[PDB]
Amino acid sequence: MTWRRFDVAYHDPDLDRLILAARPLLSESPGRSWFQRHWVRGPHLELWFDHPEPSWERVREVLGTHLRAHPSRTRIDPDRLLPQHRRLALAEQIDEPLLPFYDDNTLHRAVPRSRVHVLGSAAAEDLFHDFHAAASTAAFDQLDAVVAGESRLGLAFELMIAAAHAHAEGGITGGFVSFRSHAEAFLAGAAGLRERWEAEYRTRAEALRAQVAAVVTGTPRGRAWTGLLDGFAGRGDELIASGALTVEVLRSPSFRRYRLLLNLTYLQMSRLGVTAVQRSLLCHFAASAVEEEYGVSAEI
């Protein structure tokens, strides 16, 4: 299909109220629509629509109003960032303008990027767009909770646990291995940062174990997330089997389906504002909590 992309430049990492101000635009008219946080040309919110409404004028009305009342006041440095962005663009296989960085608190029309070269096919891209549409709607409710005082990280941790228990072969004591792998890949040998993470785990060990257990047993939020994931599991299996969806035990359909659904969960955490370091921390915590709660070792 034929997408429109709008970039809302907002340099403050806290996007929650901006995203909630955008909610009517993503909720009022026919068509798929979704949002994500992105870095290119500086921190910004992206709004994606496959149908003609909301118009550019309507987007400007709703968001221009917000931005005049509640502007970002975080300063950045487009010359300390540009190097890192050129590297990241190579890594993420992005091919689009990197400069100039957007002025803070401005709206821009932008070119929708294709991800077919990464995902493997137009059918794979459409699956991810369909996920982003459903999950964006879910994210507004999750951000409402955060704005009201609930823990962002706690909510993200719940999605992760629920995803593993519902969608990994063997449940949580199968799927936690991916959490330890993710945390160690991020640490890249950092013994000192690992020690810090392990001390932060130990301080919270019973509380984390209790949350794992609560999610495994079933929570309305966990069940709602895994229900959303269930709508993609069969399509994911089909596209993995046909080769239309590129993959990253390794030959196992169940493993590859879990890895897809877990990666969708990570994309949701990003939508919620959980940074890469924080996601990795949560992975460390989840793996440790699972090991202690169930008497297992990522020995498997």
Side-chain angles (χ1 to χ4, degrees), residues 50-210:
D50 77 357
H51 270 61
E53 294 292 334
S55 65
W56 180 208
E57 186 174 291
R58 168 78 180 142
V59 171
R60 288 192 325 264
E61 168 191 41
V62 172
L63 298 176
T65 300
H66 181 81
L67 290 171
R68 284 195 294 281
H70 301 108
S72 162
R73 290 284 171 252
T74 297
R75 304 181 60 202
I76 64 168
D77 184 1
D79 292 313
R80 184 192 173 287
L81 276 26
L82 182 61
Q84 295 181 247
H85 291 196
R86 298 214 141 119
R87 289 169 176 76
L88 192 54
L90 265 155
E92 299 192 358
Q93 298 189 58
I94 287 293
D95 185 29
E96 67 190 82
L98 305 178
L99 288 176
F101 277 38
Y102 297 132
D103 290 346
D104 207 3
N105 307 299
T106 60
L107 302 172
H108 300 266
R109 303 195 85 141
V111 175
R113 67 181 69 80
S114 178
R115 303 300 288 161
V116 163
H117 59 300
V118 174
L119 294 178
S121 67
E125 178 172 72
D126 218 59
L127 182 56
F128 277 64
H129 289 154
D130 288 339
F131 168 76
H132 287 302
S136 290
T137 296
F140 293 118
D141 296 308
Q142 290 162 333
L143 292 169
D144 269 343
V146 171
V147 167
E150 291 199 63
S151 177
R152 188 197 310 286
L153 298 179
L155 288 181
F157 189 81
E158 171 170 50
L159 305 183
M160 288 168 43
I161 302 304
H165 196 57
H167 286 110
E169 179 151 307
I172 189 58
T173 63
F176 82 107
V177 177
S178 284
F179 301 150
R180 182 60 73 212
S181 177
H182 186 103
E184 286 301 314
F186 175 89
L187 287 166
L193 182 60
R194 190 191 297 105
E195 181 188 67
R196 288 184 178 178
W197 290 3
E198 214 11 73
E200 299 289 352
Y201 172 76
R202 187 103 264 130
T203 65
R204 296 176 182 77
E206 165 53 27
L208 290 165
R209 290 170 60 179

Side-chain angles (χ1 to χ4, degrees), residues 13 37-39 84 88 92 152-153 156 160 178-188 193 197 263 265-285:
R37 307 187 187 219
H38 210 285
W39 55 265
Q84 295 181 247
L88 192 54
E92 299 192 358
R152 188 197 310 286
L153 298 179
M160 288 168 43
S178 284
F179 301 150
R180 182 60 73 212
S181 177
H182 186 103
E184 286 301 314
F186 175 89
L187 287 166
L193 182 60
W197 290 3
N263 275 288
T265 302
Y266 299 149
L267 288 172
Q268 189 70 351
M269 297 171 39
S270 299
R271 232 195 298 287
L272 300 180
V274 180
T275 64
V277 67
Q278 291 174 329
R279 174 171 77 239
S280 301
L281 176 71
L282 291 178
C283 287
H284 181 106
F285 284 177

Side-chain angles (χ1 to χ4, degrees), residues 234-248:
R235 295 171 61 182
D237 273 339
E238 181 188 332
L239 299 187
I240 289 169
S242 70
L245 175 58
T246 304
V247 299
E248 296 161 297

Side-chain angles (χ1 to χ4, degrees), residues 21-34:
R23 190 179 191 164
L25 299 169
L26 277 84
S27 307
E28 70 192 9
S29 295
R32 297 180 292 179
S33 67
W34 59 272

Side-chain angles (χ1 to χ4, degrees), residues 204-218:
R204 296 176 182 77
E206 165 53 27
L208 290 165
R209 290 170 60 179
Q211 186 176 5
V212 170
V215 178
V216 167
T217 298

